[PDB]
Amino acid sequence: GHMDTIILRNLNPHSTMDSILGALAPYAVLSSSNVRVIKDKQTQLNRGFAFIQLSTIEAAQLLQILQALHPPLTIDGKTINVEFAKGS
């Protein structure tokens, strides 16, 4: 049960969490365990989506901010996408 999770999309192969955590964090800044970028082992690439684990209301708050203002950024030449799986 995802219970307040922001999802990300459109992550490039070469990107990593620590890169995104610089230029995807104007409003709020996660720590690190929050930002699940799954990565391959053979290709040494990402899976291209990610997950942001936050508190019961914090996920919801942060996301609503992002759904009311300028479009998201890029950190490689790929404009990120935001999703919300509030499956409680």
Side-chain angles (χ1 to χ4, degrees):
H2 290 107
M3 298 174 79
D4 264 280
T5 304
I6 310 181
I7 303 140
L8 298 181
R9 275 177 138 156
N10 204 57
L11 311 173
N12 249 12
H14 283 265
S15 302
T16 187
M17 175 187 73
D18 265 76
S19 312
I20 304 152
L21 280 177
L24 203 90
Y27 294 94
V29 194
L30 297 320
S31 283
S32 43
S33 87
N34 310 85
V35 186
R36 261 283 209 262
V37 186
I38 312 169
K39 333 88 175 295
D40 206 284
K41 317 204 304 188
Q42 303 298 109
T43 59
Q44 295 288 309
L45 312 178
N46 308 309
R47 292 271 51 260
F49 50 88
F51 303 98
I52 304 158
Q53 286 90 105
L54 279 167
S55 199
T56 322
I57 303 175
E58 289 277 73
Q61 283 187 135
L62 196 169
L63 181 109
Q64 285 163 112
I65 304 165
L66 280 30
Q67 292 191 353
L69 55 83
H70 268 209
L73 232 143
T74 155
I75 326 87
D76 219 68
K78 34 63 164 168
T79 324
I80 304 312
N81 259 221
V82 200
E83 265 273 341
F84 190 44
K86 214 296 219 78
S88 63

